[model samples]
Target: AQPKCNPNLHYWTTQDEGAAIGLAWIPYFGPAAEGIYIEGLMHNQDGLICGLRQ
Candidate 1:
């Protein structure tokens, strides 16, 4: 299953901006790629990225 991303929801990613990943927009709008960025993880158990939940 997939989770929903709400507006104003803060998240982090290690992928650089304008970089192309499996998904594109995320990288474009996400912050610069740096050390493990401590932001937020999906609250739902989507089994999309990982088979397990947080």
Candidate 2:
């Protein structure tokens, strides 16, 4: 029984908003018009990965 995340899990942004299971913050580039939002049961695994920043 490992299914929990959505203490009112809220997210909405072209550039800002809410919470779920604590701690979610983003800013490196913002605003693409209604860019990020989350609501109940969402999962994405292994699709895109790129790195090299220091």
Candidate 3:
């Protein structure tokens, strides 16, 4: 069951203890932020890795 994505806004749930889901949105970084935020929960330790363009 996938949720709806709203531009630069989406939901994310972490696995770490005390972890939870959040309606997080990436800050505006040109047009790229829209793409990153659209990816939903795809993130690494450094956060937001669209082709590791961090």
Candidate 4:
């Protein structure tokens, strides 16, 4: 069975672990000090992708 989730911000995957299973809304981005906020998708090192919307 699958847990309840939001369709607008959700992801389905057969390959679990070492990857995210949902959208990653990067509200901010920077070199760990200063950054800008933007609602969009994100990608993992493995190439797996996800997104966010606001």
Candidate 5:
């Protein structure tokens, strides 16, 4: 069964900033696809948290 609220499936793709599994904004902004990047993942089957990034 699907949960009534799934935060993972939701994201701010339309905003002028953010990161994901793909290129979000490029053609709209003059930046060369480089900014504050963060990675999120589920850990220990407990809940989600922000991890390290390259």
Candidate 6:
């Protein structure tokens, strides 16, 4: 079932100065797209983490 709205999702996407994703200004002051590049993936569950880019 669809879960209720929450803040956790909001935090990871727009909080912590973007340290986790290295896009500190991604929340408000968006920088160049190159700031977050993407590379091919071929591993274990770790592949799921690729969502942030793909």
Cα displacement (Å) at residue 7, model 5: 4.4
Poorly placed runs, candidate 1 (over 4 Å): 3-36, 42-47, 50-54
Highest-scoring model, lDDT: 6
Candidate 2, residues 4-54, lDDT tens digits: the string is: 332223222211332233223333232322234422222221122221210
Query: Which pairs clash in model 2?
Result: none
lDDT, candidates in the order shown: 0.30, 0.26, 0.30, 0.28, 0.31, 0.33
User: For model 1, how does the per-residue alpha-carbon lDDT over 1-54 read when each residue is reduced to its tens digit?
Assistant: 334543223222322321223233443423332223422222212234333242
Query: What lDDT tens digits, residue by residue, belong to model 6 across residues 1-54?
Result: 223433244344333434444544344444443234311111212223434333
Give a tens-digit lDDT track for model 4, residues 14-42.
11221243223334432231222221334
User: Candidate 6, residue 48: CA error in Å?
Assistant: 24
Native RMSD of candidate 6 (Å): 12.5
Candidate 6 displacement at residue 2 in angstroms: 16
Clashing residue pair totals per candidate (backbone < 3 A): 0, 0, 0, 0, 0, 0
All candidates in order of lDDT, best leading:
6, 5, 1, 3, 4, 2
- TM-score, predicted candidate 1 vs. hidden true structure: 0.16
lDDT of 6: 0.33
Please list the residue runs of candidate 2 whose C-alpha ends up more than 4 Å from where it truly belongs after superposition. Answer: 1-24, 33-54
Locate the minimum summed-lDDT window of 10 residues in model 6.
38-47
- lDDT per residue (tens digit) for residues 1-54 in model 5: 223332333434312134434344334442443333322321111112221220
Of the two candidates 1 and 5, the one with more favorable lDDT, higher being better, is 5
Judge candidate 1 against the unseen true structure and give its global Cα lDDT, from 0 to 1: 0.30
Q: What does candidate 6 score on TM? A: 0.19
Model 6 stretches astray by more than 4 angstroms: 1-4, 18-54
